[PDB]
């Protein structure tokens, strides 16, 4: 506990002292490039020349979205999306590399324009550790 | 990079800057850039035959390049070109082009001034390529005739034709990016066409332009004008091409298409139906886009903004510093094999270790080559994989191709081969650079031993907290992993923590015992503190080295108990000998004061900050110098391990109880504050009753306020000192203050007794409201309570008023801190950028990248600052009688010889005439030394940092040989006398078989020898130290060895050292100069003032010393004060009046009726000017009416009729009439000359003169130095030239803070001396110490080029140093433009150039070359 | 050496370089009242002979440019009547060595 | 020119090895040793190229020579074998 550092009661940390929740919300939109040409929320696959992400696509449902219960990690794809060119091209959203948690709430709406709008929140509990500030 | 090439690999030895010839631009080009388009023609989205285009380099990952067929990574890119429809000025040379035009005839191309002109002949002689062009321009600019003929050198009557036409020259002005001329009813005005300018330039002779700043081969003036524009390839302007149906062209690609578009517009316009006043329109546009492409942030012109309105990145702006290519991409770089996390301290790591979190260790790798030694280990790490801790990530084959152990299908069956590299995880004891930013020190980056640990923080030893300036308040640090067997060696052998222990910044250690360990060490080492066996055994085991020997307890019979002192001495190594006396420490140390460690055992004294801290005579400072940096680093750990363990079990705390002071002590404080408040009121009423007399050179208000704040401070101090005394030894705050671990008096004072007076801008809280500090007070309330005196302690709590006034002063702190952090930042950088290239050479000299001498030998002595210690020069002080008793030996005097009790020879040595000749000469030299030392250190200061700790050598010798201070020595007079003489010859700093280098050597060792002769005199050696021949011979061999070790190492980057050693202490300055002798501007603001070589300085002042035989006489001092302090007629005048008194013989004014009658016993103006003078003003300035009168009389001579009243008359009056239409208006002009202009007495600028009784250490008749206080005059203005010649002063002693002035009057040499003094006084005022050499080097640098070179943009950065080097600080693009225009050649010896070129710099490890000798190789095998 | 009270007219000043090889010095009486060379801060400057200077440059492998400079108008430079190129050996006392010698070339 | 090389007789740099010359000799030799160069000392079970290099330096069996450059560009060559290693 020298030079502005402190000792913390491990026993107390377990019993729930200074333990916190953490949430992050990721968002996406089906953009309408020109007329009729629209982006699609779907779980993509290896078809012709689509620049797909390295992360696990297997956590996505057919709607290109993770189910709220699921536990995510690393660069796991949490939102699946495709963009057409003139077959498809990847435009999927992977969970922040430097992070991991459990999918919390998934919101499916429409933006003012009338296009599909999505917000994915991921919950993580952060327990006090050795480098943590107080 | 990457593929193999047969081409020979060399290093850039020189950079030849120059300008592109259009011809080159075409030759060098791979494509004629024709269209603004980038691709998609014929449909195909793939680069067009116009812009970008394959001919230039690849857009795609194609493998194609057309030119080299190499592919993106390997291909550098190739330049294309645009042929411009009309010539255009290169934006960066418009001013130079104008100056060339101003120098040459705008018609025949001849240089306007010939070698026929004498001033021109002198200007032509100038060897500096730039200074010549400056002198040439200033001479030719004001030549508006191209002469046909000129007067001949022989005779000016018979003129000679020099050649050239007879055309009038234009007055050129800059209007945007155009040049307009004005020739000679009314002048002719027209723009000068770019073509016309160019044509005239093309006609300038080689001899003419090489006489200007230019170069025939590399920069012909005509190349400043652009006709053929180079097109940078795609890698300069990368198309960030995302997806297939999208691209993302660079700003430069757009600006180039703009240039292209504007050009075609112009070319089609001029070729076709040219309206000629629409052609000039499109040409202006092409000039704009070519200008705005290179520099967009042009002076007083609109920005060439993007679609967005976004200004457009100019190539200039790309290179412009802090984030430019130079400052951000070349002097700095983001780098691979680097890590960063939160730091947190650990008592169980060794000083030189660094705790690396497993995750970090698992990411960072070292490329180890498979060799028979590691082949076996390495295959295990590869087996382990990239996921297990001691494992590896990649295997690099002979082929150069990388194997990814994470995915390789052969990751399990890899069979290594000698030569392959295994990129393994960083493992325990790998050397790594550890760094806490800002990096202001050598020590802000040190090398540590890896310790792979769990948890996500970097762990560091607490004693290494201080050099890094790290806290665990959430601080993060950087780790950099070396990759070469060679760069590791660099880290381990040059910058590892143990080496870095004794810093050359202050010739003292930069690490010591801190916090818990400091607090607990005092506690452990008390007389009162004893340890029972159980714990003694644990405290021993905890010392990892401990010899396994249980020490015999200090107490045996009642109970076996050990003392704190005792078992701590187990960590102190043998042969460690320390002695220190505090307050009143005797050898029977009554208070447990001082320190006495013998053979590494504590005899007496408490161990606290002065002993175990980072002190000048430290237990650390000694253990390093005596036992090794390694041995010392171990000691850090050992001391910690014991003390920390003992404190873990003793415990330590602090509470509100520790702020609580005694009831009666509180009564005493409340009273102290009360009586001070009354002392203030008594003065407040005294000033309100107009009885208070103002201080010399101070307003009544200034005087009153001074007394008030002096009382209210005296008060806070006394109140605090009451609590301080009353706090028991058990007071936890007092305990921390005592060890020196945390806190000081003021902390105790403010918390327990009284916070004190609050101050903003040097003064008590001012009336922000009309005549009140707050609305809660009445008007004109000068009380302690109103102007912000905080009566209360922190314990008692502040009142609402107190709270706000505290907050007002508090905020001033936070701002001043914020401002200083900024100001000191730049000061550090300018210091570094000004000294970079300064290094010690293999000839002991100190030189820059030009090889110009700065110091003839590093810091005048040629010693490495780390190997120096404060030592006493004994022969300097004391009585001559006491010196005599100490050093004189007279074998011819029965009671002044050496007693036979001292040496064997004693009996037979008496009367030995031949020997007395040796001791006589020995003594005559000791006398010589004494008088010399007294010439060097005038104040008689004896304690000076020198290189060999002679005290310690003799100490160790006595211990080593068990010197018996009883039996007589076996030394002979010749043994001592000649042994010392012989040693002196072997103390080599400079080797060189010539009188210059040899006399240099004699000088360099002049002071050290003085100390040597002082400490090894015959009487001392025999009577004091009781040395045997053996012991003596050893002392000599050791002094020699230690001395040689102490000299500076060629390669020492002594420049950066000095810069940082001044800079980092500046960042630690509180400032400015308290909240109030003279109040001179100090710290950061005065340091800024100095380095800038500011002419208008804040506090200019003189320190005039009185004539030798006049020092004591105050009346003599008063006389000079009177003689030098400036006095005006304005200062003595109450009012000025103009009357109409028509008869000079009578007077309308009846007061003057008496004054006329007299000054008209033993034609003039009827208008009278009457001045009333103030008796009081005349009295403070000790003036007479006649004194004033005569002064007016001599100012107007026979033009003004002056009469005046006598010093007795009720009213002091001066009557003035003019001598010999429109006369009244004249008197008002005279009254202004009278008040404003006229000077009564004193020297101009010398505005306020204070008398000071300064103390002075001076030798007494008896010999001893004695306090002889003298009267001294302190100025409030500077006029050195004039106050020097004033009688009654000592002009040999006069000083001024304005060194600019000292430089001007006494020479550059004295200027240097004063400059050092002033730099030193900034550092010394903040308490802090910086070793002479550092401050000397800065001062020497600012002075070598005869005169005061500032540490600024136009100071050092305007030197003849490397163009690349200089661009790396402040004027970057401008510098590089001039480099091309004047065809500069960078030598490439500056650190900076090699840093830019990515080459091994000629610095330290780079100062020499390594070669293999086949001869010796074959001899070893 | 011409010791003048207040001024030497520019018409008279023309005559100063008019008679070479002989050199002429103009000194204001007022400046000479105090011998600046006597000052605490002013060390001893020693004019070096052609041979002495040659040896200096030889022994430190120096080009004149490399040597630390002194302005031709520097008070001490004027006192010693230093001409361009003349090198002065400056001997100052040192707190590091006892005595230190620097050299300054004229301009 | 080869007026650049200062002769063995009449040489004046320290007869001692600089902290830098040591750091670079040890590094250079450890680098060479590390990339399978022949070792001139008997490794008495040694395996770290720096520890091997240090042994090489300690036995003065390092076949390198330091070319000490002077400010004018001239130089004195000193053998690792002949330089005093106090440090
Ligand atoms: Mg902090
Ligand atoms: Zn290419
Ligand atoms: Zn002409």
Swiss-Prot record, chain A:
Domain of life: Eukaryota
Signal peptide: none
Positions that bind Mg(2+): 4
Modification sites for Phosphoserine: 86
UniProt-annotated location(s): Nucleus
Family of this protein: Belongs to the RNA polymerase beta chain family.
Biological role: DNA-dependent RNA polymerase catalyzes the transcription of DNA into RNA using the four ribonucleoside triphosphates as substrates. Second largest component of RNA polymerases II which synthesizes mRNA precursors and many functional non-coding RNAs. Proposed to contribute to the polymerase catalytic activity and forms the polymerase active center together with the largest subunit. Pol II is the central component of the basal RNA polymerase II transcription machinery.
Additional observations: The binding of ribonucleoside triphosphate to the RNA polymerase II transcribing complex probably involves a two-step mechanism. The initial binding seems to occur at the entry (E) site and involves a magnesium ion coordinated by three conserved aspartate residues of the two largest RNA Pol II subunits. Present with 18700 molecules/cell in log phase SD medium.
Quaternary structure (record): Component of the RNA polymerase II (Pol II) complex consisting of 12 subunits.
Descriptive protein name: DNA-directed RNA polymerase II subunit RPB2
Species: Saccharomyces cerevisiae (strain ATCC 204508 / S288c) (Baker's yeast)
Residues of the full protein shown: 834 to 980 of 1224
From Swiss-Prot, chain B:
UniProt-annotated binding residues for Mg(2+) 1: 471, 473, 475
Residues of the full protein shown: 3 to 1454 of 1733
Residue span of region Bridging helix: 800-812
Keywords (A to Z) from UniProt: DNA-binding, DNA-directed RNA polymerase, Isopeptide bond, Magnesium, Metal-binding, Nucleotidyltransferase, Nucleus, Phosphoprotein, Repeat, Transcription, Transferase, Ubl conjugation, Zinc
Gene Ontology CC entries for this record: cytoplasmic stress granule; mitochondrion; nucleus; RNA polymerase II, core complex
Name of this chain's protein: DNA-directed RNA polymerase II subunit RPB1
Class in the EC hierarchy, top level: transferase
UniProt-annotated location(s): Nucleus
An individual GO BP term: transcription initiation at RNA polymerase II promoter
Source taxonomy: Eukaryota, Fungi, Dikarya, Ascomycota, Saccharomycotina
Modifications made to the protein after synthesis: The tandem 7 residues repeats in the C-terminal domain (CTD) can be highly phosphorylated. The phosphorylation activates Pol II. Phosphorylation occurs mainly at residues 'Ser-2' and 'Ser-5' of the heptapeptide repeat. The phosphorylated form of Pol II appears to carry, on average, one phosphate per repeat. The phosphorylation state is believed to result from the balanced action of site-specific CTD kinases and phosphatases, and a 'CTD code' that specifies the position of Pol II within the transcription cycle has been proposed.
Similarity comment: family membership: Belongs to the RNA polymerase beta' chain family.
EC number(s) per entry: 2.7.7.6
Swiss-Prot record, chain C:
Highest taxon, organism lineage: Eukaryota
Localization, UniProt: Nucleus
Quaternary state and interactors: Component of the RNA polymerase I (Pol I), RNA polymerase II (Pol II) and RNA polymerase III (Pol III) complexes. Component of the RNA polymerase I (Pol I) complex consisting of 14 subunits: RPA135, RPA190, RPC40, RPA14, RPB5, RPO26, RPA43, RPB8, RPA12, RPB10, RPC19, RPC10, RPA49 and RPA34. The complex is composed of a horseshoe-shaped core containing ten subunits (RPA135, RPA190, RPB5, RPO26, RPB8, RPB10, RPC10, RPA12, RPC19 and RPC40) where RPA135 and RPA190 form the DNA-binding cleft.
Function, in words: DNA-dependent RNA polymerases catalyze the transcription of DNA into RNA using the four ribonucleoside triphosphates as substrates. Common component of RNA polymerases I, II and III which synthesize ribosomal RNA precursors, mRNA precursors and many functional non-coding RNAs, and small RNAs, such as 5S rRNA and tRNAs, respectively. Pol II is the central component of the basal RNA polymerase II transcription machinery. RNA polymerase complexes are composed of mobile elements that move relative to each other.
Family: Belongs to the archaeal Rpo5/eukaryotic RPB5 RNA polymerase subunit family.
Protein name: DNA-directed RNA polymerases I, II, and III subunit RPABC1
Swiss-Prot record, chain D:
Chief subcellular location: cytoplasm
Keywords: Cytoplasm, DNA-directed RNA polymerase, Nucleus, Phosphoprotein, Ribosome biogenesis, Transcription
GO cellular component terms given for this protein: cytoplasm; nucleoplasm; nucleus; RNA polymerase I complex; RNA polymerase II, core complex; RNA polymerase III complex
Segments for region (Leucine-zipper): 43-64
Gene Ontology terms describing biological process: nucleolar large rRNA transcription by RNA polymerase I; ribosome biogenesis; RNA-templated transcription; termination of RNA polymerase I transcription; termination of RNA polymerase III transcription; transcription by RNA polymerase I; transcription by RNA polymerase II; transcription by RNA polymerase III
Domain of life the protein comes from: Eukaryota
Localization (cell): Cytoplasm; Nucleus
Keyword Cytoplasm: yes
Molecular function (Gene Ontology), one example: DNA-directed RNA polymerase activity
Complex formation: Component of the RNA polymerase I (Pol I), RNA polymerase II (Pol II) and RNA polymerase III (Pol III) complexes. Component of the RNA polymerase I (Pol I) complex consisting of 14 subunits: RPA135, RPA190, RPC40, RPA14, RPB5, RPO26, RPA43, RPB8, RPA12, RPB10, RPC19, RPC10, RPA49 and RPA34. The complex is composed of a horseshoe-shaped core containing ten subunits (RPA135, RPA190, RPB5, RPO26, RPB8, RPB10, RPC10, RPA12, RPC19 and RPC40) where RPA135 and RPA190 form the DNA-binding cleft.
Note: Present with 6090 molecules/cell in log phase SD medium.
Protein family according to the UniProt entry: Belongs to the archaeal Rpo6/eukaryotic RPB6 RNA polymerase subunit family.
Gene expressing this chain: RPO26
């Amino acid at each position: 506990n020298q030079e502005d550092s402190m000792i913390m009661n491990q026993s107390s940390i377990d019993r729930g002292l200074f333990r916190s929740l953490f949430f992050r919300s990721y968002m996406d939109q089906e953009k309408k490039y020109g007329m009729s040409i629209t982006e699609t929320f779907e779980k993509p696959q290896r078809t012709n020349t689509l620049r797909m992400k390295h992360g696990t696509y297997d956590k996505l449902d057919d709607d290109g979205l993770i189910a709220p219960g699921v536990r995510v990690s690393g660069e796991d794809v949490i939102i699946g999306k495709t963009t057409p060119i003139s077959s498809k091209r990847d435009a999927s959203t992977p969970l922040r590399s430097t992070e991991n948690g459990i999918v919390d709430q998934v919101l499916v709406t429409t933006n003012q324009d009338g296009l599909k709008f999505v917000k994915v929140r991921v919950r993580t509990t952060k327990i006090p550790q050795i480098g943590d500030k107080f | 990079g990457q593929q193999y090439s047969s081409a020979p690999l060399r290093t850039v030895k020189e950079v030849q800057f120059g300008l592109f010839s259009p011809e080159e631009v075409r030759a060098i080009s791979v494509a004629k850039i024709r269209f603004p388009e980038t691709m998609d023609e014929t449909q195909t989205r793939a680069k067009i035959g116009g812009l970008n285009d394959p001919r230039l380099g690849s857009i795609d990952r194609n493998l194609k390049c057309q030119t080299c067929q190499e592919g993106m990574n390997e291909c550098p890119g190739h330049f294309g070109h645009i042929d411009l429809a009309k010539p255009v000025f290169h934006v960066g040379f418009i001013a130079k082009i104008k100056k060339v035009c101003e120098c040459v005839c705008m018609h025949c191309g001849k240089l306007l001034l010939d070698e026929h002109n004498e001033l021109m002949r002198q200007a032509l002689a100038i060897k500096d390529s730039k200074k010549r062009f400056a002198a040439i321009w200033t001479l030719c600019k004001t030549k508006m005739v191209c002469e046909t003929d000129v007067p001949s050198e022989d005779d000016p009557t018979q003129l000679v034709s020099r050649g050239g036409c007879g055309n009038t020259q234009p007055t050129i002005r800059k209007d945007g990016l155009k040049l307009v001329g004005s020739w000679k009813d009314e002048p002719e005005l027209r723009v000068l066409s770019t073509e016309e300018i160019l044509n005239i330039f093309k006609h300038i002779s080689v001899k003419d332009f090489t006489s200007l700043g230019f170069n025939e081969v590399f920069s012909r003036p005509e190349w400043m004008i652009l006709t053929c524009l180079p097109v940078p390839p795609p890698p300069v302007r990368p198309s960030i091409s995302f997806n297939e149906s999208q691209r993302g062209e660079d700003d430069l690609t757009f600006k180039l298409a703009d240039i292209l578009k504007a050009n075609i517009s112009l070319e089609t316009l001029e070729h076709n139906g040219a309206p000629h006043h629409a052609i000039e329109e499109a040409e202006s546009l092409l000039q704009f886009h070519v200008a705005t492409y290179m520099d967009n942030d042009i002076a007083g012109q609109p920005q060439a903004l993007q679609k967005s309105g976004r200004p457009v990145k100019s190539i200039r702006a790309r290179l412009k510093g802090k984030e430019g290519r130079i400052r951000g991409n070349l002097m700095g770089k983001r780098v691979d094999f680097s890590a960063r996390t939160v730091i947190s301290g650990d008592p169980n790591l060794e000083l030189d270790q660094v705790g690396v979190p497993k995750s970090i260790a698992k990411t960072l790798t070292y490329p180890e080559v498979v060799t028979p030694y590691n082949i076996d280990r390495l295959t295990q790490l590869v087996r382990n994989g990239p996921n297990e801790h001691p494992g590896a990530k990649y295997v690099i084959r002979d082929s150069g191709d990388r194997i990814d152990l994470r995915y390789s299908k052969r990751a399990g069956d890899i069979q290594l081969q000698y030569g392959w590299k295994v990129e393994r995880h960083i493992m325990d004891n790998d050397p790594v650079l550890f760094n806490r930013q800002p990096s202001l020190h050598k020590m802000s980056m040190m090398a540590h031993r890896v310790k792979v640990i769990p948890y996500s923080t970097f762990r560091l030893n607490l004693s290494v907290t201080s050099p890094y300036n790290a806290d665990f308040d959430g601080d993060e640090m950087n780790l950099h992993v070396p990759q070469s067997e060679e760069t590791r060696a660099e880290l381990s052998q040059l910058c590892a923590v143990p080496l870095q222990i004794v810093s050359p910044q202050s010739n003292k250690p930069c690490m010591g015992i801190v916090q818990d360990t400091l607090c607990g060490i005092r506690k452990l080492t008390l007389r009162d503190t004893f340890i029972e066996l159980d714990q003694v055994l644990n405290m021993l085991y905890w010392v990892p080295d401990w010899d396994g020997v249980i020490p015999t307890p200090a107490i045996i019979k009642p109970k076996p108990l050990w003392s704190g002192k005792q078992i701590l001495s187990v960590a102190i190594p043998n042969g460690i000998h320390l002695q220190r006396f505090d307050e009143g420490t005797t050898l029977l140390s009554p208070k447990d004061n001082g320190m006495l460690i013998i053979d590494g055992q504590i005899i007496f004294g408490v161990v606290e900050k002065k002993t175990v801290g980072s002190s000048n005579g430290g237990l650390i400072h000694v253990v390093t110098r005596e036992k090794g940096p390694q041995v010392c680093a171990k000691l850090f750990g050992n001391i910690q391990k014991v003390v920390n363990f003992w404190l873990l079990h003793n415990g330590f705390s602090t509470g509100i109880g520790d702020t609580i002071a005694d009831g009666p002590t509180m009564r005493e404080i409340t009273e102290t504050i009360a009586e001070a408040k009354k002392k203030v009121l008594d003065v407040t009423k005294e000033a309100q009753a107009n009885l208070l007399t103002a201080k010399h050179g101070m307003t009544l208000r200034e005087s009153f306020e001074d007394n008030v704040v002096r009382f209210l401070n005296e008060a806070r101090d006394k109140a605090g000192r009451l609590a301080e005394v009353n706090l028991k030894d058990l007071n936890n705050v007092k305990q921390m203050v005592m060890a020196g671990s945390k806190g000081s008096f003021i902390n105790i004072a403010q918390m327990s007794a009284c916070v004190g007076q609050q101050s903003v801008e040097g003064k008590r809280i001012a009336f922000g409201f009309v005549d009140r500090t707050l609305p809660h007070f009445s008007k004109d309330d000068y009380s302690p309570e109103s102007k912000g005196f905080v009566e209360n302690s922190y314990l008692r709590g502040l009142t609402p008023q107190e709270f706000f006034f505290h907050a007002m002063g508090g905020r001033e702190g936070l701002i001043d801190t914020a401002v200083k952090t900024a100001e000191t930042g730049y000061i550090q950088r300018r210091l570094v950028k000004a000294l970079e290239d300064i290094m010690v050479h293999y000839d002991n000299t100190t030189r820059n990248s030009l090889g110009n001498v700065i110091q003839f030998i590093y810091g005048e002595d040629g010693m490495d600052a780390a190997h120096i210690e404060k030592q006493s020069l004994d022969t300097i002080g004391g009585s001559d009688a006491a010196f005599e008793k100490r050093y004189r030996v007279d074998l011819l005097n029965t009671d002044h010889t050496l007693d036979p009790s001292l040496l064997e020879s004693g009996s037979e040595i008496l009367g030995d005439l031949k020997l007395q000749v040796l001791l006589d000469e020995e003594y005559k030299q000791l006398v010589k030394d004494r008088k010399f030392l007294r010439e060097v250190f005038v104040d008689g200061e004896a304690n000076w940092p020198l290189p060999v700790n002679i005290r310690r050598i003799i100490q160790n010798a006595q211990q080593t040989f068990h010197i018996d201070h009883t039996k007589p020595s076996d030394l002979t007079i010749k043994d001592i006398v000649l042994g010392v003489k012989d040693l002196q010859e072997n103390l080599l700093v400079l080797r060189g078989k010539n009188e210059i280098i040899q006399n240099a050597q004699r000088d360099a060792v002049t002071l050290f020898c003085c100390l040597l002769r002082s400490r090894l005199a015959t009487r001392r050696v025999l009577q004091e130290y009781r040395l045997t021949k053996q012991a003596f011979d050893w002392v000599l061999s050791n002094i020699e060895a230690q001395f040689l070790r102490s000299v500076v190492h060629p390669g020492e980057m002594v420049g950066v050292l000095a810069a940082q050693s001044i800079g980092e202490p500046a960042t630690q300055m509180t400032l400015n100069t308290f909240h109030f002798s003279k109040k001179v501007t100090s710290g950061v603001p005065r340091l800024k003032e100095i380095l800038n070589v500011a002419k208008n300085m804040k506090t200019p002042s003189l320190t005039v010393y009185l004539e030798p035989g006049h020092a004591a006489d105050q009346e003599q001092a008063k006389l000079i004060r009177s003689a030098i302090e400036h006095t005006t007629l304005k200062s003595v005048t109450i009012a000025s009046e103009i009357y109409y008194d028509p008869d000079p013989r009578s007077t309308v004014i009846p007061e003057d009726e008496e004054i006329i009658q007299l000054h008209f016993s033993l034609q003039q103006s009827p208008w009278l000017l009457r001045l009333e003078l103030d008796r009081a003003a005349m009295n403070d300035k000790d003036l007479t009416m006649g004194q004033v009168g005569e002064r007016i009389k001599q100012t107007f001579k026979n033009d003004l009729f002056v009469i005046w009243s006598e010093d007795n008359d009720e009213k002091l009056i001066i009557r003035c009439r003019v001598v010999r239409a429109e006369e009244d208006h004249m008197l008002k002009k005279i009254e202004n000359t009278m008040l404003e202009n006229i000077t009564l007495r004193g020297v101009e600028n010398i505005e306020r003169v204070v008398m000071m009784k300064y103390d002075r250490k001076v030798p007494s008749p008896t010999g001893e130095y004695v306090k002889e206080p003298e009267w001294v005059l302190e100025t409030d203005g500077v006029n050195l030239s004039e106050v020097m010649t004033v009688p009654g002063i000592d002009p040999t002693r006069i000083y001024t803070n304005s060194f600019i002035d000292i430089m001007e009057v006494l020479g550059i040499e004295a200027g240097r001396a004063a400059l050092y003094k002033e730099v030193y006084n900034v550092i010394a005022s903040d308490g802090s110490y910086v070793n002479y050499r550092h401050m000397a080097l800065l001062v020497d640098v600012m002075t070598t080029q005869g005169g005061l070179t500032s540490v600024t943009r136009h100071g050092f950065n305007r030197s003849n140093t490397g163009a690349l080097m200089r661009c790396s600080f402040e004027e970057t693009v401008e510098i590089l433009f001039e480099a091309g225009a004047s065809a500069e050649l960078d030598d490439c010896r500056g650190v900076s150039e090699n840093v830019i070129l990515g080459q091994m710099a000629p610095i330290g490890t780079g100062a020499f070359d390594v070669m293999i000798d086949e001869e010796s190789l074959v001899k070893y095998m | 050496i011409f010791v003048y009270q207040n001024n030497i007219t520019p018409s008279a000043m023309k005559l100063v370089p008019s008679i070479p090889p002989a050199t002429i010095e103009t000194f204001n009486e007022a400046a000479l009242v105090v011998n600046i060379t006597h000052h605490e801060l002013v060390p001893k400057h020693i004019r070096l002979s052609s041979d002495e200077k040659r040896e200096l440059l030889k022994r430190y492998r120096l080009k004149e440019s490399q040597l630390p400079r002194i302005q031709r108008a520097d008070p001490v430079a004027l006192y010693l009547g230093l001409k361009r190129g003349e090198v002065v050996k400056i001997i100052r006392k040192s707190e590091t060595s006892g005595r230190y010698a620097s050299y300054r070339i004229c301009m | 020119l080869k007026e650049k090389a200062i002769p063995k007789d009449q040489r004046a740099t320290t007869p001692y090895m600089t902290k830098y010359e040591r750091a670079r000799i040890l590094g250079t030799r450890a680098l060479q040793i590390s990339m399978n160069a022949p070792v001139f000392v008997d490794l008495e079970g040694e395996t770290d190229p720096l520890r091997i290099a240090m042994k090489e330096l300690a036995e003065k069996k390092i076949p390198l020579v330091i070319r000490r450059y002077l400010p004018d560009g001239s130089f004195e060559d000193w053998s690792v074998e002949e330089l005093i290693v106090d440090l």
